Amino acid sequence: TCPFYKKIPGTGFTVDAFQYGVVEGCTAYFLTHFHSDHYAGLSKHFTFPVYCSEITGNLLKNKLHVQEQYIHPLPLDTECIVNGVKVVLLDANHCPGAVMILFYLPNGTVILHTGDFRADPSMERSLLADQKVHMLYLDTTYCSPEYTFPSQQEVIRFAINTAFEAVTLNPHALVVCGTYSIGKEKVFLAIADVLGSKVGMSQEKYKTLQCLNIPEINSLITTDMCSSLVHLLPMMQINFKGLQSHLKKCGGKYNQILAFRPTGWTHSNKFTRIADVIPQTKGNISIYGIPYSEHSSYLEMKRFVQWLKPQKIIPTVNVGTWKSRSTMEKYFREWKLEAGY
Numbered sequence: 001t002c003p004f005y006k007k008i009p010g011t012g013f014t015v016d017a018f019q020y021g022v023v024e025g026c027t028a029y030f031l032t033h034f035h036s037d038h039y040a041g042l043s044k045h046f047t048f049p050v051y052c053s054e055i056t057g058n059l060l061k062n063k064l065h066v067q068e069q070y071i072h073p074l075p076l077d078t079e080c081i082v083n084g085v086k087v088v089l090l091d092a093n094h095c096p097g098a099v100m101i102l103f104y105l106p107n108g109t110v111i112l113h114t115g116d117f118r119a120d121p122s123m124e125r126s127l128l129a130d131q132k133v134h135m136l137y138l139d140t141t142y143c144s145p146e147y148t149f150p151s152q153q154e155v156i157r158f159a160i161n162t163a164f165e166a167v168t169l170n171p172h173a174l175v176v177c178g179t180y181s182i183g184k185e186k187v188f189l190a191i192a193d194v195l196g197s198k199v200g201m202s203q204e205k206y207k208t209l210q211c212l213n214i215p216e217i218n219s220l221i222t223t224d225m226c227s228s229l230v231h232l233l234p235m236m237q238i239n240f241k242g243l244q245s246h247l248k249k250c251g252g253k254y255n256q257i258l259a260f261r262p263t264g265w266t267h268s269n270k271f272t273r274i275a276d277v278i279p280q281t282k283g284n285i286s287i288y289g290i291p292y293s294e295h296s297s298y299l300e301m302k303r304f305v306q307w308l309k310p311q312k313i314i315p316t317v318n319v320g321t322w323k324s325r326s327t328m329e330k331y332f333r334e335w336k337l338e339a340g341y
């Protein structure tokens with residue numbers, strides 16, 4: 001059955017709760033963003049109202065084939081009424097179309113559900129600052145002090161300079177970027193922009209990108225692999241074997257590959273700075289691991305929560321074991337004692 005952390009008290013609303021069949025009492029299902037864990041169970045067969053951003057609606061319509069009658073897209077940064085209750089969608093700084101949702105309950109309680117997010121200080125001057133938030137449903141993916149990472153901009157700058165140098169040294173090199181869902185699009189778009197190229201990709205991936213309201217998209221992406229010097233491949237193909245194989249397929253138009261694997265955190269965040277990063281190399285193929293994160297680091301999460309000062313925190317990630325929950329509760333108490341709420 002639908003867990004209490006996906007239910008909004010004193011409404012018949014749920015959030016990211018599609019895998020449990022019909023939820024008893026639920027009159028509106030919210031979807032924070034288009035990642036399969038969150039949408040799991042949604043298909044052309046679903047027949048209840050889904051509330052979401054415009055981008056998330058395009059994806060539901062076109063990729064999942066959810067019938068149009070059940071998609072209720074809402075604009076960002078706008079007070080809307082849903083089944084008698086005031087809501088606002090805010091940018092989550094996660095993947096394209098990802099939202100946080102603010103719920104103003106009839107009793108006067110205010111609840112923020114973050115969805116998946118990368119906390120940022122720009123969120124301190126949104127509509128959130130206008131009133132007290134009593135309850136917070138929090139993306140706790142990286143809720144432990146070991147999880148540090150560089151800013152997105154430091155990582156993109158590194159990617160840009162690396163790719164530009166390699167292709168100026170060898171104008172017959174191909175750049176490859178690995179991908180598995182939506183998100184982290186700036187990696188491949190910034191590399192292509194410094195090389196004066198479009199990004200080449202499969203028909204399924206192109207169809208996905210065409211839904212995302214990216215300005216001038218038709219000038220940035222193509223399905224003609226031949227004509228482009230940055231290609232997108234599935235993350236699973238980002239290895240020496242898969243990349244040699246791809247290079248055979250391109251018809252001797254390239255004689256070298258430089259590949260990027262954008263990942264989350266891995267253990268080498270605890271020593272290395274972005275400027276020290278060196279690739280793995282086998283022959284005419286190099287692979288760079290770059291920690292481009294679309295989740296809050298420990299320090300970014302702590303800052304946001306210490307600013308917000310919620311009366312109660314409800315974790316939404318890593319809640320499956322008592323050890324994880326206990327560990328998280330400890331950090332929430334420390335933050336509360338330091339900041340005086």
Ligand code: NI
Nearest residue numbers: 033035094116
């Ligand atoms: Ni996500």
